[PDB]
Amino acid sequence: MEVIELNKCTSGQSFEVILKPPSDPSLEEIQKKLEAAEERRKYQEAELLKHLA
Amino acid sequence: MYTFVVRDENSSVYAEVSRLLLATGQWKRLRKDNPRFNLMLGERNRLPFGRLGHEPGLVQLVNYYRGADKLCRKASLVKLIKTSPELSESCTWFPESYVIYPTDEREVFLAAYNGNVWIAKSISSEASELLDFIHVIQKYLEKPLLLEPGHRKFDIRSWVLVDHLYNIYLYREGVLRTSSEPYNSADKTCHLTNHCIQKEYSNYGRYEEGNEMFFEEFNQYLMDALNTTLENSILLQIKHIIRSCLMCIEPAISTKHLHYQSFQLFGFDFMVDEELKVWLIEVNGAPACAQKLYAELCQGIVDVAISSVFPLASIFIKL
Amino acid sequence: MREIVHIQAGQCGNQIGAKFWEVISDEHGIDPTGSYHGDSDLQLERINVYYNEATGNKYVPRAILVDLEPGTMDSVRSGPFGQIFRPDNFVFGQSGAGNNWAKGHYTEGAELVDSVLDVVRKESESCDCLQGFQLTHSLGGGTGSGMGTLLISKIREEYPDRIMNTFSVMPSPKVSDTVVEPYNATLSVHQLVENTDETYCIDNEALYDICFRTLKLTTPTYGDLNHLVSATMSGVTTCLRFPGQLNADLRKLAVNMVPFPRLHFFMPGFAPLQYRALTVPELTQQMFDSKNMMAACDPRHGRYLTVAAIFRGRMSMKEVDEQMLNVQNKNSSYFVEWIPNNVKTAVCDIPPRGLKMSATFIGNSTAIQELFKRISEQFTAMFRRKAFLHWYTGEGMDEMEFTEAESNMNDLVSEYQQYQDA
Amino acid sequence: MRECISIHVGQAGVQIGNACWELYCLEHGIQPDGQMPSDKTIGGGDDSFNTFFSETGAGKHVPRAVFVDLEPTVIDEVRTGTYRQLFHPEQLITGKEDAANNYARGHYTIGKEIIDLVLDRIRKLADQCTGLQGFLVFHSFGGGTGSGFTSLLMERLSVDYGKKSKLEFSIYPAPQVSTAVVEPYNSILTTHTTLEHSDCAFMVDNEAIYDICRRNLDIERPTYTNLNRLISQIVSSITASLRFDGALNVDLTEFQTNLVPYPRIHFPLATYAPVISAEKAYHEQLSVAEITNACFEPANQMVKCDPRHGKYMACCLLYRGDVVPKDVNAAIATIKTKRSIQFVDWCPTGFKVGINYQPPTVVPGGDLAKVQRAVCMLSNTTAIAEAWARLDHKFDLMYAKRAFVHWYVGEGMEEGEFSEAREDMAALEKDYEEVGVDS
Ligand SMILES: Nc1nc2c(ncn2[C@@H]2O[C@H](COP(=O)(O)OP(=O)(O)OP(=O)(O)O)[C@@H](O)[C@H]2O)c(=O)[nH]1
Ligand SMILES: Nc1nc2c(ncn2[C@@H]2O[C@H](COP(=O)(O)OP(=O)(O)O)[C@@H](O)[C@H]2O)c(=O)[nH]1
Ligand SMILES: COc1ccc([C@H]2[C@@H](C)C(=O)N2c2cc(OC)c(OC)c(OC)c2)cc1O
Ligand SMILES: [Ca+2]
Ligand SMILES: [Ca+2]
Ligand SMILES: [Mg+2]
Ligand SMILES: [Mg+2]
């Protein structure tokens, strides 16, 4: 069991004890998808209004 | 009225416990996938312990211990004994063992290779024929004890129940499974002493009934023939071996402070040599029972493993 | 401010709507003058879901009263809380609808609908955040049924993204005005399947039975039945009307109670129907007994898809869960397993007038199919001989619209059966 | 010094935020008016607490925080609660109507229309930062806002601050507290969408916290206030190293470095002890050994699971109070010999310890008693995967019959995002399967 990297200060202390060693989407793509979903809504609403007519 | 489900349809013993639970009128069964249960009797493979103990207002209980396969797969058993401090390398009741891949140990296996006849399953005298089976390798026990008359080998099966509190219960009744056929030396019938190459090729249950001899009978034989008892010559070692194995794995499988609880039934298998020394063959996580016992035992389970946790409206020795 | 606009139509719709307002106005501490004299602010914190404020700080129901003849509304007006309503909010014709769905939907009702939509628009436009609409009506007459469904269509057209909710009284031979009730109800259910998000099915058969085999009323009046309906309606709206650990609103309700868009017809339950307060275990048992259901289907003939239950009064939240959980884990045959955690429980501290403990249940059960079968069988018994149809063909309808309405109800039934067996 | 910005989203995010900031103010000695007597550099500074607070010429200390909810009622209690003076009105952002427990409505429909305003109000905070490390995002998995809006915001923060670190505190759904049957759906959805955008996420299963409040504070029916105060103790322990002088976990990059070798497996299990009732008349103050030991009981984990049956990838101990290294190593010694603590082969069996001599602060009239020493352990075990398997199974139960899906489709989402989300989680379960188990 070894202690390593000890650091002290007025608030407390830090250290590391060892027991054994070892053997992005763009803005445009977002806008696309967020608008291909507005369209689906709009479409659904347009179907509704057609049927109501 | 307590509740439970069944996820191994074709499990002899638990089939019987299900059946016995309804006969009390206090237990209702549910469908396999209904999570609102008090008691699971889970599957043999990939039991989802991850989904137990997250149902509000239910105490839940299952008939298996997560991590018990450590003791029930031979590779893991060997590894567990060689590696566990509380077991030492050679603890003296386990056959000399090596685990080799299709660890492995091949090299250190050969250093202690200078009676050099073995067995590698999961029997040969020469290394090649078995090693070319492309498992575990053990030292086959050349000089076993024989029952008389018949020069007949045998193994012992003992049944262990472990409850949610980690009490260790050894069933009063054990069974001898004999190769009631004379015993040669290097002819391949008596060598595999069990109902695993005799229920097909092998004159079935000759010298004794269905190859199965019981405890009263065997104790009398041990008295008459050897001037000893079963308790002295054999059971102390057995009790010691069971304690040592289960107590070894206790802190890794125990459900003392878990959100669900476990119990499980094991079948320990032993061999006695001619010096009246007991050896551990293997540990079975889902054992069958023996026809005339699947009753006293199956009810014992209910009494101690279940109604202990779920009280209603001895055949075991504590270890 | 999640306002609700309430609409009540026809004789039944206005009779029960009126009782409803009597009950909740009393729970909120408003008197027949719209003046507040309550003792808490739990009464006032969400008072605006149902009530608009006045110049003198009075409270006035966000309610619109509709009928094709004036009788009932004259009664409502001359009743106990009659003067609370906005008088501009009484909208009525003179001729009636003759228990005829066609007159309410197509002829007589068409002529009144726009003035109703005018009062609706006037009430919506001053809403900080309108949740949706609540309609009280029966399905067996002409006004509440034909005109009520017509109204729901128009409202959906003008406010397609608001929630539409009905309390819908289903007819029964036991307590019946005319023989054409099955026709009117089968035509109305068809509209309700397409155009509502939530419908509370209030069966008059059940209300009669609870009144007769339980309340021990030997000759049950519409007032008796409406007293059950009043209690159920008050219970079912407790979580909207009061502050709790839940924020209840109509949309969240619909999201959590309706897994398939067409299966939004709910069986309500109530307990109790007295100086000894009930204990939590009794509430729980009673609520879930068929005898406390108001739709006249037996819940053991089907399975619960979802359930919402409130307990009213000061009691043991722990004992509630214990009991709730208990009745599930005693009856798992009658809840679906493929919807985890499908029973939800809440507690309000304020109980209703005259009880220190009560419990109200909203169930989406597949057993409701029994109700639709009952109606279908009756519809078909006449329609197969085209009996009574001239009353509708004379207002312009064709048999075709009937055959379709029949078909869509039987499909609804098949749908409920499919999920009872999954 | 290097700033951190906290973003609270939805009821859970906001309410937990209230708990945490209240705590922060009690710990650093800041008053409800934003005044901090002990801050002698009036109107500026770059002490450690300045990571979470900026200052104004009049000596007011102001949270580097943004609260966001699609409905106003929760954030209104902040707008006019005990700490109304702390915040700039523009840090509190509210919509008209909420997401109705619908991920799709929070993400696509309503999100789209508040997102630019949110990013903007956040930019106004980043602009006051000389060297911003990144973000701390608090939210529920189960709400419509907490799931949908959060994943949208996390998608955009990656674009506008591609260099910054992002950490989550997420509320995982439990039936004994939950508000909706569709929480599994929202959970999977938000996890899938948010996964490649977050660096370290601390899950808190509400079930576990509820149980802890019951079992240790002897509260019959724990409230949000109870749960939240406890969760805030944990968050405080975790964030204490950014706001105080120390040498472990000093920036958000260090959380990733120390706890997350694989980018996808970034959910460290938190364990905390001790939790002690304020109405416990007689209380025997516990020891280093005892509390460190308690870090290996499931009953103290933020997510119930059984680490004996997984492998570790990292372990961090964080003590607060009367603790010195000697007692720590002694406790580790004894524990190593009683417990089964397996690390993976390609990582060191060991512990990164950090200590702060100031003991835990508690809310006066709270339900937590004051203790002399406390610890929070952050480990990365494969065992937490159990919590994915639970969630996924619930999802599978509902999605097989397509129950509730129409509410999502109705908002613009396609049924395909469900099978995609779920496939991603199937992949995640598999990854944990490799790292932790042997074929
Ligand atoms: N621990 C804790 N959990 C909470 C709290 N508030 C809500 N939750 C949990 O959050 C989930 C519901 O999410 P909310 O945060 O309330 O939803 P939301 O983000 O406001 O989204 P909406 O659906 O639009 O209201 C449920 O699992 C609740 O149990 C809280 O204050 N503390
Ligand atoms: N429960 C209840 N049912 C009613 C009431 N009034 C009428 N009904 C039922 O409603 C149906 C008749 O509809 P009604 O409201 O009278 O006709 P409308 O004026 O055309 O809407 C029948 O099924 C009656 O049984 C009432 O006050 N309470
Ligand atoms: C799972 O089923 C639920 C059913 C109902 C709710 C809540 C939330 C949607 C709300 O509003 N519900 C609600 C509304 C209720 O009335 C509006 C109500 O009883 C009257 C009730 O009892 C538990 C719950 C939450 C749920 O999780
Ligand atoms: Ca006319
Ligand atoms: Ca300063
Ligand atoms: Mg064998
Ligand atoms: Mg009438």
Asked if the Cβ–Cβ distance from D357 to A3 is below 8 Å, we say no
- The domain that contains B313 carries what CATH number? 3.30.470.20
Instruction: Please report, for residues B249, B257, B283, D176, D212, the alpha-carbon distance to residue D297 in angstroms, rounded to integers and kept in the order given.
Output: 17, 8, 29, 22, 12
CA D73 vs. chain centroid, Å, equals 22
Q: Is residue B59 within 8 Å of B310, Cβ to Cβ?
A: yes
DSSP assignment of C38-58 equals: -S-STTTTTGGGTEEE-TTS-
Ligand 3, atom 4, residue with closest C-alpha: C308
DSSP-based three-state secondary structure for A7? strand
* Atom 27 of ligand 3, nearest CA residue: D180
Strands B316-318 and B168-171: antiparallel
In this structure, are D51 and D195 located in the same domain? yes
Residues C167, C266, single domain; the answer is no
Token pair 């069933």: residue: B171
**CB-CB contact of D340 with B252 (8 Å):** yes
- Alpha helices per DSSP H over B186-235: 215-226, 230
**Same domain, residue pair B165 and B57:** no
Q: How far is D189 from D417, CA to CA, in rounded Å?
A: 8
What's the token pair of residue D53? 């607070």
CA of C389 to the centre of ligand 4 (A): 21
Q: How is residue C48 written in tokens?
A: 């605006």
| Boundary-marking domain end, from D237, D268, D299 | D268
Task: List CB-based neighbours of ion ligand 7 within 5 Å.
Answer: C 11
Same domain, D288 and D311: yes
Q: Which residues contact D232 (CB under 8 A, 6 or more apart)?
A: D16, D19, D20, D22, D23
Q: Are residues D35 and D148 in the same domain?
A: yes
Smallest Cα–Cα separation from D195: which of A35, A25, B51?
A: A25
| Whether D377 and D400 share a structural domain | no
User: Which CATH number covers residue C374?
Assistant: 1.10.287.600
Closest C-alpha among C118, C133, C120, C151 to residue C2: C133
State if residue C144 touches ligand 2 by the CB under 6 angstroms criterion.
yes
Q: ∠ at Cα C44 (C42, C50), nearest 5°?
A: 120
- The binding site of D consists of 11, 71, 140, 144-145, 179, 206, 228
Q: How far is CA C70 from CA C11, C74, D31, in A?
A: 10, 6, 65
CB-count exposure of residue D166 (10 Å: 0-12, 13-18, 19+):
buried
Catalytic residue among D3, D254, D411, D417: D254
D377 and D422 fall within a common domain: no
Strands of the sheet containing A2-9, edge to edge, are: A2-9, A12-20, D349-356, D312-321, D373-381, D269-273
DSSP line for D294-363: GGG-GGGBSS---GGGS-EEEEEEEEEES--HHHHHHHHHHHHHHS--PBPTTS-EEEEEEEESSPPP--
Q: Which residue from D minimizes the CA distance to C321?
A: D176
* Among C256, C128, C151, residue whose Cα is nearest residue C197: C256
User: Are D291 and D390 within one domain?
Assistant: no
User: What residues of chain B lie within 8 A of the CB of C329, using their CB?
Assistant: 3, 36, 57-58
Amino acid at B100: I
Mutate to test the interface with A, among C157, C159, C161, C191 (most CBs of A within 10 A): C157
Residue finishing a domain among D268, D298, D329: D268
Residue in B with minimal Cα distance to C328: B36
Say if CB D318 and CB D237 are below 8 A apart.
yes
- Cβ of B30 within 8 Å of Cβ of C328? The answer is no
Asked if B172 and B279 sit in the same domain, the reply is yes
Count of domains observed in chain D: 3
Does residue D274 share a domain with residue D257?
A: no
Residue B283 lies in domain: 64-95+143-319
DSSP state of C309: E
Token pair recorded at residue C396: 């312009």
Residues annotated within a binding site of C: 11, 69, 138, 142-144, 204, 226
DSSP C290: G
Burial class (CB in 10 A: 0-12, 13-18, 19+), D41: exposed
Q: How remote is the CA of residue C158 from the centroid of ligand 4, in Å?
A: 25
Determine the structural domain holding residue D408 and report its residue range: 384-439
Question: Looking at the structure, do residues B200 and B68 belong to the same domain, yes or no?
Answer: yes
Residues in chain C closer than 8 A to D398 (CB atoms): 259, 338-340
Task: Single out the residue of D93, D3, D18 nearest to residue D55, CA to CA.
Answer: D3
C145 plus C213 within the same structural domain:
yes
**Strands laid side by side in the B136-138 sheet:** B97-99, B136-138, B119-121
- CA atoms within 13 A of residue D188's CA, in its CB half-sphere: 26
* Same domain? D259 vs D273: no
The reply to whether A38 touches chain C by the CB within 8 Å rule is no
Same domain assignment for residues B157 and B37: no
Whether C292 contacts C367, CB under 8 Å: no
Report the nearest-CA residue for atom 25 of ligand 2: C176
The CATH number assigned to the domain holding C362 equals 3.30.1330.20
- Report the first-to-last Cα separation within chain C, whole angstroms: 40
Q: Do A49 and C156 touch (CB under 8 A)?
A: no
Domain co-membership, D151 together with D263: yes
| Residue ranges in chain B assigned as alpha helix (H) | 12-22, 69-72, 74-83, 106-111, 127-131, 215-226, 230, 236-253, 296-301
CB contact (8 A) between residue B1 and residue C330 = yes
Mark whether B51 and B192 lie in a shared domain: no
CA of B165 relative to ligand 1 center, distance in Å: 38
Same domain, C398 and C283: no
Domain end point (choices D268, D298, D313):
D268
Does one domain contain both D264 and D275?
no
Is C247 within 8 Å of D224 when comparing Cβ atoms?
Answer: no
Resolution in A for the shown PDB structure?
A: 2.5
Rounded to whole angstroms, how far apart are CA atoms C38 and C45?
A: 12
Q: Do residue B75 and residue B24 come from a single domain? A: no
Same domain, C377 and C348: no
Query: Amino acid letter at C36?
Result: Y
How many structural domains are present in chain C? 3
Domain span at residue C227? 1-259
Residue C205 φ/ψ region, left for φ over 0, alpha for ψ in the -120 to 50 degree band, beta for the rest: alpha
Who contacts D427 (Cβ-Cβ below 8 Å, separation ≥6)? none
Residue D112 and residue A34 in contact, taking contact as beta carbons nearer than 8 Å: yes
Looking at the partner chain, which of B36, B56, B57 has a beta carbon nearest the beta carbon of C332? B36
**Residue C95 CA to ligand 4 centre (angstroms):** 7
**Rounded distance between C-alpha atoms, residue C213 and residue C211, angstroms:** 6
- Chain A residues whose CB is inside 8 A of the C153 CB are 52
In this structure, the answer to whether residues B147 and B161 fall within a common structural domain is yes
Residues C156 and C219 in one domain: yes
Local structure of residue C172 (DSSP, 8 states): B
Q: Same domain, yes or no, for B223 and B315?
A: yes
C24 CA: distance to closest CA in chain A (Å)? 35
Q: Is D254 a known active-site residue?
A: yes
CB contact under 8 A, D354 and A40: no
- Is residue B187 domain-shared with residue B84, that is, in the same domain? yes
Residue in the structure block whose two tokens are 């037996």: C298
Residue with tokens 């100031």: D358
Do D298 and D399 reside in the same domain of the chain? Answer: no
* A51 interfacial to chain D (CB closer than 8 Å): no
C321 and B34 in contact by Cβ < 8 A? no
**Closest atom, ligand 2, to C-alpha of C68:** 19
**Measured in angstroms, how far is the CA atom of residue C268 from the centroid of ligand 3?**
13
Q: What is the DSSP letter of C143?
A: I
CATH number of the domain within which D413 lies = 1.10.287.600
Whether residue B32 lies within 8 A of chain C, CB to CB, comes out as no
Residues B253 and B295 placed together within one structural domain of the fold: yes
C178 and C292, same structural domain?
A: no
Q: What is the tally of helices (H) and strands (E) in chain A?
A: 2, 2
> Does the beta carbon of C97 lie inside 6 Å of ligand 2?
yes
Residue B86 sits at φ, ψ, to 5 deg, of -75, 0
Q: What is the CATH number of the domain that holds C38?
A: 3.40.50.1440
All residues of chain C having their beta carbon less than 8 Å from the beta carbon of residue D394 are 340
Same domain as B27, residue B153: no
According to the entry, how was the structure determined?
X-ray
Beta-bridged to residue D61, according to DSSP, are: D55
Same domain, D378 and D388: no
* C191 and C55 within one domain: yes
Residue with tokens 């603890």: B91
Q: How far apart are CA D270 and CA D268, in angstroms?
A: 6
Burial class of residue C345 (count of CB atoms within 10 Å of its CB; 0-12, 13-18, 19+): middle
- Does residue C157 belong to the interface with chain A, where contact is any CB pair within 8 Å? yes
B278 lies in the same domain as B158: yes
Sign of CA dihedral C182, C187, C188, C190: positive
Report the distance separating Cα B274 and Cα B272, nearest Å: 7
